[PDB]
Amino acid sequence: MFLISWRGYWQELIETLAWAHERTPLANLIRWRDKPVALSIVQARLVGLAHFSVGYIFTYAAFLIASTSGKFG
Amino acid sequence: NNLPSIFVPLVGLVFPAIAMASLFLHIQKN
Amino acid sequence: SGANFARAFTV
Amino acid sequence: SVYFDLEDLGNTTGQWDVYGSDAPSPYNPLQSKFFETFAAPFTKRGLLLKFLILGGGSLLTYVSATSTGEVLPIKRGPQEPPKLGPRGKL
Amino acid sequence: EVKILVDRDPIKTSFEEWAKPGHFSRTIAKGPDTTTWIWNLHADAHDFDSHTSDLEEISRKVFSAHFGQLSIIFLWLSGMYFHGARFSNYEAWLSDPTHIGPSAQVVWSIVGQEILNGDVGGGFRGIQITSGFFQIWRASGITSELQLYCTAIGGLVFAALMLFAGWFHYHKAAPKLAWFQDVESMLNHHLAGLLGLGSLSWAGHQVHVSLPINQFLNAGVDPKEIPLPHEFILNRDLLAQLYPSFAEGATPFFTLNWSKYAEFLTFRGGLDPVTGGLWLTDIAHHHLAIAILFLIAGHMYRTNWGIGHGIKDILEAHKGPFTGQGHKGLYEILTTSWHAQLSINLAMLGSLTIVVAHHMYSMPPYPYLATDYGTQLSLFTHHMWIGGFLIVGAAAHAAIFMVRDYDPTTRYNDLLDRVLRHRDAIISHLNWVCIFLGFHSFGLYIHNDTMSALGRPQDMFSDTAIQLQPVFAQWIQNTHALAPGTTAPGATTSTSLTWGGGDLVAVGGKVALLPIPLGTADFLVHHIHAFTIHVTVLILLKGVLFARSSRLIPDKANLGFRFPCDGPGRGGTCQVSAWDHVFLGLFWMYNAISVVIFHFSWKMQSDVWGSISDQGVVTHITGGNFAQSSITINGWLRDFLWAQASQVIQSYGSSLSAYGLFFLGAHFVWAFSLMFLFSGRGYWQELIESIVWAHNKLKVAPATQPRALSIVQGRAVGVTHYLLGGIATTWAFFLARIIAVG
Amino acid sequence: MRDLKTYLSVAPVISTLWFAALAGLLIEINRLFPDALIFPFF
Amino acid sequence: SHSVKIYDTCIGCTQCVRACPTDVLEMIPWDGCKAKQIASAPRTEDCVGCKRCESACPTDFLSVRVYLWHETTRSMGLAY
Amino acid sequence: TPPQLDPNTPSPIFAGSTGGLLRKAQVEEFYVITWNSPKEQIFEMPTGGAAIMREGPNLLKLARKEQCLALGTRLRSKYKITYQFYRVFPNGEVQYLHPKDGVYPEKANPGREGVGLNMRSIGKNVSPIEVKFTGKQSYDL
Amino acid sequence: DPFIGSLETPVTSSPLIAWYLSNLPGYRTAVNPLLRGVEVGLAHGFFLVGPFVKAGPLRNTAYAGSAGSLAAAGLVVILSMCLTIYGISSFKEGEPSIAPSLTLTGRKKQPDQLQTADGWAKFTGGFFFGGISGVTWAYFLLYV
Ligand code: CLA
Ligand code: CLA
Ligand code: CLA
Ligand code: CLA
Ligand code: CLA
Ligand SMILES: CC1=C(/C=C/C(C)=C/C=C/C(C)=C/C=C/C=C(C)/C=C/C=C(C)/C=C/C2=C(C)CCCC2(C)C)C(C)(C)CCC1
Ligand SMILES: CC1=C(C/C=C(\C)CCC[C@H](C)CCC[C@H](C)CCCC(C)C)C(=O)c2ccccc2C1=O
Ligand SMILES: CC1=C(C/C=C(\C)CCC[C@H](C)CCC[C@H](C)CCCC(C)C)C(=O)c2ccccc2C1=O
Ligand code: SF4
């Protein structure tokens, strides 16, 4: 997700979602304090890298421990 | 003994709820 | 069917 | 066909409450009096927050601790005899 | 009125233009200063709309390109027919089709690749083919090789004729603009002429040639003893013995007592027990009815005479409750821009291809096709991939039209403006429905996995714990099962055996068709299909709608259809062009098609295909574990990807080694694509700088200075490699598994 | 004839002829000498 | 608000002023070149950081530079 | 030049769209663009769709400066029409924004002050180590 | 006003729809927030009781009703905590309300007192009381 898709599409999506939330009844009594914006570029790259590393590490750890513990030899 | 039955819910639910409430209040506070 | 296969191995 | 003026900006930028109603209260006066009398202690904000947090924590901890083994499988404990490991380990 | 208008020798055939490249565009024609020039020369080769502005030149170029494409297609068909004639075992397969594998490619003996000449059967060695051509030829009535040779020669001649026609129409007599814009005559000829006469002639061939030869073949006669097709035409005695009705000649048809032709024009339906295909009489009858219908429907539009209908009158005069004035300026829009026509035609063709795939797997139309599992799998997968690609391309061309061919001053349309004025509501509702559908559909699988891992199999969404049955589909199946008795008095049996109820049909010890049950797994998989389709639609529709202008960029039309970004400001504005939306939607189309083909393959291998014994029991390929193991992601990873990949990887040293080699190569290409997809241009340019310094140190620097690929080119390369790798992996896996076990 | 030669001198056509000739030479060498893992001439 | 700085290498070709989509830059008379004019950036608080001005600037290295800085509602381009 | 006013100008003919003003208009600010058209003609709105501008003076409300400038430059390029836009706050203050000197910025005019001019080449800036531990920046000097 | 970011459609502005939406407890203005909160809480608790008692982990045992009612009470408590946190973080104490002061006709009207610290506090207290009462009433009705 974060490593391929980039910002502009998501910013437009957030634009539309903000309009939708502002125009609906019984839900416009609640208002946001911080204007929602899409993530920056460097932040998105960092998040994608973190996801990549976490998945890599967890998958290999699970495989190694399970495969070595199954036979104990 | 039965310490886990008392301690696990506290760390799992009550303390994160208190932390989230306090942090949100401090973040939004002017 | 043999001749068709042999056509490839003529040389 | 004029849609802008400077004297009053309320209608210029569209500050309307589309579905606001100003009718008097239709609730029964006795019902309102009873509910107002019995809902007084929860009006304050900080006191309500502290009471909610403390009571929720205490109640959840008490229910979790007191609960027997029929409701919770983890409180029943193991029943079948233990089994050995792959290479004869215990 | 309607007339032929041509221009004589608009261009002169000369080799002078070939010498210098990039003559279509001036900036290309100036000369190469950097390597980027080369990459541009191929990017704008077929951008006829940007080379000039006159409609006449664009139309003429389009006509010539169409002729060239037709010539290429004819050459390909001729090559296939010649391969069938020369290097093949068609005659061996004709006598014993069930125990012989089709093969029409023979490998040379150069290096050690001779092991690719596997023993398909019938005293032949060669690569097994899965194109389904042998069934087509058998259903056509071809029983020798001289006929195939003649067909190949005719195809070559037709290709040459098409090439000459293309040259003649571009360089000698070029039709004028008013000729192209005569859509009434075009529609009349395309409906009455191309689709009516063609199907009528094919019905004539089926009635006169295919039916008697196929009857003789099914009767058990040897192929070498069957009379030649023209002997049936010349001799009335043979036809009379085969069909008494022909003894009366054409007299009944002119007398309106058509029941006499009920011998070879029937309405039985169902599947033929001998070959497991549709009755050829039904197919001929359907073709005749289609010919009559198309000939009737091709005379609707007014051309050069008093009678007919006007397209403009029909569009303008249509007043409805929801539309209103509505369709007023659509005629000019659809007769002025090529891109709108391209988009509509692409969408229609993609949908048609998908429907073709569904109907073709449902009811086998060729003899001995159902029992060939590899052919069925290959045909289904190929056609669905083609349909998906075409449907995706339609949106890109719609975006192109909206960007460069839309002006509200000269040509104004009410419905288009009304759609444009409230795009936010459309996008918001589509986003909500996508989120809701995906959340539920994938949360069901995640919940199943979590309850499985915790030792709680009684809290699943399964066939035993909590049931979600597709009641509507079951009701439709029951109604179709009960239809032939009451709803269809003419039809003797059901339209297809897929509907529940009926009897198993098997040919030569192999199951051909049986009713397909529906349970919880089908419910979940269909909802996943809906989710993926909705997300792809959302991406493409957003890209099309927000092409002209957006809240972030109020002047996105000036920048154009293909611009990488607008800048680091506004928080970042990468990938705002419609081209980037198409590039993003390609991945989701790939995801949806992959999931659908996986579902089809597993369901068919589990609950339909298999083997039948003399006693009567049926043993399926995978033991029917789809109904209980496909409700968890672990089940899809273990019982499907892990179990069915044994044949692909253990094919080394055998006649299927090429499949394993391609299996590894596709993985390599898929891993390679991420290099372009993840990185950026500046790093590569800065590295090329040092490399160029190292070159210049030794006086070997080129005049065309090296340059890193542009952003759009990098994204295009990445998506191309990604799609190619994934598709090749699936192709190798499917073909290896189904050839080995099928 | 000048422009025909000029077009046949362009990069893709010259490249494909050169690579086809090289591939033919390699193929013929591999056919004449079936397989070899070392250089046994010397 | 970002920071836009004009250096003295400018030659006064008026391209950066035309390219700006928010009316940030302008030109003033000068005497350091042949064209006798230079650029200036009074309305910096309106800059959105699009860096269109830097794209159209003929010089060995750009004579107008945009450095991104603290963001705000106007510079971020929020319509709500 | 003295800034002008926009008392009672009418508006172009429109049917309505969902790309109009939002809560920010009531809360923070909006912009008002005024021009003069010699004939009633159809143009294309920045928000989306097509509208019709009347003869005489025309006035429009928008949410951002970019939309106003894009519409104005389209008017200048295609219709040859002068335009001017202001910024309006919730308090009623009106600020004149477009040409402040009565002349478009692309043309030089005496009486304009120089802002943000560095009298050196872009490669004469000091290194970040020179400005460390202070608030100023290298390009600011 | 066409240039406002909204559209007039049959569903958005209809006599039946406007009449129905203008009578809901969350849209009255002259009523003090406590009663409206009580009504909203009653409705929400009575609605919420069902799914917990029907699809919980103990739905097949004899402990379904009590466990479901307790879960619904916990959800009500959490929602009350969220409402209190939002009210504390959003509205200030002494500032006047921020509700619109004129209707579609343009006639001036008193601003709603819900968008204030004391008003929101009253609303949250009423919602908590109503939710608890609705939960216990639903439990009493279902299993008696
Ligand atoms: C980190 C620690 C943690 C812990 C200790 C628990 C504990 C529990 N989970 Mg939760 N959960 C967690 C994290 C955790 N969860 C996370 C991260 C997720 C997201 C995946 C979930 C999602 C989840 C689901 C989807 C479900 C649970 C359920 C349960 C309960 C199952 C016991 C039982 O068999 O039901 C016995 C029967 C009961 C209904 C107990 C009723 C009494 C409850 C606990 C309320 C007591 C009221 C109290 C005032 C609450 C307010 C205090 C506030 C501060 C929280 C138990 C209370 C189940 C459940 O309770 O269903 C509603 C269940 O279905 N959990
Ligand atoms: C995505 C959908 C999904 C769904 C439907 C379920 C469903 C279920 N889960 Mg699973 N689960 C999921 C995903 C999902 N899960 C995921 C992602 C995880 C993390 C791994 C889990 C992990 C999990 C655990 C750990 C447990 C369950 C269990 C259960 C049950 C408890 C449900 C519950 O009590 O709350 C229901 C609460 C409600 C308040 C319902 C709200 C929705 C209402 C009906 C909306 C209707 C709206 C209205 C009609 C719209 C129009 C309004 C108009 C009328 C005005 C239930 C059968 C529990 C169990 O064991 O059950 C057997 C359990 O312990 N789940
Ligand atoms: C009844 C006569 C007739 C027929 C049969 C066709 C048929 C066709 N037209 Mg249409 N067309 C017609 C009238 C006709 N047209 C008229 C009057 C106009 C002007 C309004 C057009 C305008 C038109 C355009 C602008 C284009 C086509 C194209 C096509 C081809 C589509 C490809 C295909 O579907 O494969 C079906 C495959 C086959 C039937 C090919 C076999 C060869 C056929 C039988 C040749 C005989 C057809 C020809 C009309 C008669 C010869 C005329 C000449 C000898 C004097 C196909 C050949 C498209 C095309 O492919 O470009 C060339 C295309 O771009 N047509
Ligand atoms: C029905 C036929 C069809 C036709 C006639 C067109 C026509 C047009 N398209 Mg559309 N398009 C279609 C279908 C079609 N499209 C589909 C199905 C898609 C979805 C992918 C698209 C998506 C699309 C995009 C994204 C773009 C166009 C554009 C264009 C125009 C420029 C063409 C170009 O320059 O390429 C010249 C030729 C090439 C660049 C060839 C590229 C090589 C391909 C991608 C490789 C395929 C790999 C191969 C099969 C693998 C073999 C491996 C081996 C070689 C080692 C042209 C008018 C372009 C545009 O700018 O329009 C103005 C553009 O940006 N089209
Ligand atoms: C597994 C896939 C993959 C592969 C193969 C490569 C390959 C490479 N990486 Mg890349 N990279 C990848 C993924 C991959 N990367 C990913 C995921 C990232 C994270 C974004 C990067 C980021 C990255 C960086 C940051 C850098 C590289 C660089 C390099 C090069 C290192 C030098 C070397 O290994 O040369 C070995 C060369 C080869 C294995 C290339 C393949 C040779 C082909 C197969 C030969 C052509 C043969 C055949 C005839 C093809 C015909 C095509 C057909 C159309 C006719 C090499 C091109 C480094 C560099 O550029 O060094 C100079 C470097 O700076 N990579
Ligand atoms: C889908 C597809 C395909 C296929 C296709 C086909 C199969 C087609 C066919 C087609 C056809 C099959 C066509 C046909 C046509 C026909 C025609 C066109 C005809 C004509 C006729 C005429 C012209 C006649 C005339 C006459 C005479 C002679 C006599 C009498 C009188 C008259 C005058 C009538 C393929 C695989 C390639 C691939 C791609 C896609
Ligand atoms: C999805 C996506 C978004 C949209 C993503 C958004 C708006 C983030 C939404 C986050 C929600 C609130 C869920 C957060 C879930 C986490 C568990 C919460 C954070 C936890 C840490 C603080 C510990 C981008 O903005 C973007 C920008 C540039 C390149 C790629 C992308 C991209 O892929
Ligand atoms: C690898 C890579 C490059 C560098 C890629 C380059 C330079 C392409 C090189 C292509 C070939 C291999 C160069 C040589 C081609 C000649 C035709 C060779 C002629 C001689 C014989 C071999 C025929 C980028 O420029 C880039 C830009 C933006 C995003 C990602 C990337 C990216 O990933
Ligand atoms: S970055 Fe964009 S907005 Fe800022 S001065 Fe340059 S052109 Fe103008």
Author numbering:
A (entry chain B): 662 to 734
B (entry chain I): 5 to 34
C (entry chain N): 111 to 121
D (entry chain H): 56 to 145
E (entry chain A): 9 to 750
F (entry chain J): 1 to 42
G (entry chain C): 2 to 81
H (entry chain D): 64 to 204
Structure paper excerpt:
PSs share a common structure that includes a core complex housing the reaction centers (RC) where charge separation reactions occur and an antenna system (Light Harvesting Complexes (LHC) enhancing the light‐absorbing cross‐section of the complexes (Pan et al., 2020)). The red‐most PSI absorption arises from special Chl pairs that absorb at lower energies than RC P700, referred to as ‘red Chl forms’ or simply ‘red forms’ (RF; Croce & Van Amerongen, 2013). In higher plants, LHCI binds the PSI core complex as functional heterodimers: Lhca1‐Lhca4 and Lhca2‐Lhca3, both of which exhibit similar spectral properties and emit far‐red fluorescence at c. We obtained two high‐resolution structures of the PSI‐LHCI supercomplexes from A. thaliana wild‐type (WT) and the a603‐NH mutant genotype, which lacks RF.
The koLhca3 koLhca4 A. thaliana genotype was complemented with WT or mutant isoforms of Lhca3 and Lhca4, in which the Asn responsible for Chl a603 binding was replaced with a His (a603‐NH mutant) in both antenna subunits (Asn99 in AtLhca4 and Asn103 in AtLhca3). RT absorption spectra confirmed the loss of far‐red spectral forms in the a603‐NH mutant complex, which peaked at 704 nm and extended to 750 nm. Low temperature (77 K) emission spectra revealed a 13‐nm blue shift in the a603‐NH mutant PSI supercomplexes compared with WT, its emission peaking at 721 nm. In the a603‐NH mutant structure, the bulkier His side chain at position 103 (Lhca3) and 99 (Lhca4) caused a c. 0.7 Å displacement of the Chl a603 chlorin ring, clearly visible in the corresponding density maps. Surprisingly, the distance between the chlorin ring centers of Chl a603 and Chl a609 remained essentially unchanged across both WT and mutant proteins (9.3 Å in WT vs 9.1 Å in the a603‐NH for Lhca3, and 9.3 Å vs 9.2 Å for Lhca4), as well as the distance between the centers of the closest pyrroles of the two Chl (ring C), which changed slightly from 4.2 to 4.4 Å in Lhca3 and from 4.3 to 4.6 Å in Lhca4. The EC between Chl a603 and Vio decreased from 534 cm−1 and 524 cm−1 for Lhca3 and Lhca4 in the WT to 375 cm−1 and 384 cm−1 in the a603‐NH mutant, representing a change of 27–29%. By contrast, the introduction of the a603‐NH mutation resulted in quite small changes in the EC values between the Chl a603 and Chl a609 pair (6–8 cm−1). Notably, the a603‐NH mutation decreased the ECs of Lhca3 and Lhca4 to values comparable to those of the ‘non‐red’ subunits. By contrast, virtually no changes in the spectrum were observed for the mutant. This indicates that the major contribution to the WT/a603‐NH absorption shift resides in the different extent of the coupling of CT states to local excitations between Chl a603–a609, supporting a previous proposal (Wientjes et al., 2012; Sláma et al., 2023).
